[PDB]
Amino acid sequence: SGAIYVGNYRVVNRHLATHNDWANLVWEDSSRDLLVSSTTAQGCDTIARCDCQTGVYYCSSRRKHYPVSFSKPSLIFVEASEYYPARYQSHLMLAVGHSEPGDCGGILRCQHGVVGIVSTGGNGLVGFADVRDLLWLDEE
Numbered sequence: 001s002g003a004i005y006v007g008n009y010r011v012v013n014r015h016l017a018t019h020n021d022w023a024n025l026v027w028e029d030s031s032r033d034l035l036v037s038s039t040t041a042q043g044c045d046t047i048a049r050c051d052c053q054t055g056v057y058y059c060s061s062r063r064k065h066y067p068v069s070f071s072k073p074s075l076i077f078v079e080a081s082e083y084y085p086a087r088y089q090s091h092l093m094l095a096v097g098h099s100e101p102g103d104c105g106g107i108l109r110c111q112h113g114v115v116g117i118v119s120t121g122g123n124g125l126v127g128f129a130d131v132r133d134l135l136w137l138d139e140e
């Protein structure tokens with residue numbers, strides 16, 4: 001579990017979105033595993049605006065933050081998990097590291113702020129859903 005809180009937005013994995021998220025929907029995209037809902041209070045997070053390929057991510061299944069190198073957001077085939085069939089996911093970054101299903105929502109961060117959230121795992125990789133292209137998160 002985990003979310004990004006930027007302005008009056010809550011950014012979550014689409015597959016972990018609550019009824020309250022869907023009832024306050026701003027934008028969702030299954031291919032990215034992202035959903036954004038509206039909040040009443042303002043959030044503490046800053047979104048990175050950059051093409052960094054190094055950062056640090058939170059792994060709940062280890063209670064640890066790990067420094068990683070990661071690929072640029074791409075369209076990638078993801079094998080079946082407890083929450084999705086095998087499919088193509090877009091805007092996905094991969095790194096070498098530990099990821100189980102419950103790790104989804106952990107933040108990946110660089111020197112510029114939040115890059116994305118854990119969205120995939122298995123076979124020694126962790127996949128992150130990028131948010132740095134979503135420039136509208138920074139306003140309105």
Ligand SMILES: CN(C)C(=O)Cn1ncc2ccccc21
Pocket residue numbers: 026027134136
């Ligand atoms: C201000 N908002 C919410 C948006 O632009 C949301 N958004 N983000 C990407 C994207 C792709 C097509 C259509 C809407 C999309």
Ligand SMILES: [Zn+2]
Pocket residue numbers: 048049050051052110111112113
């Ligand atoms: Zn950066």
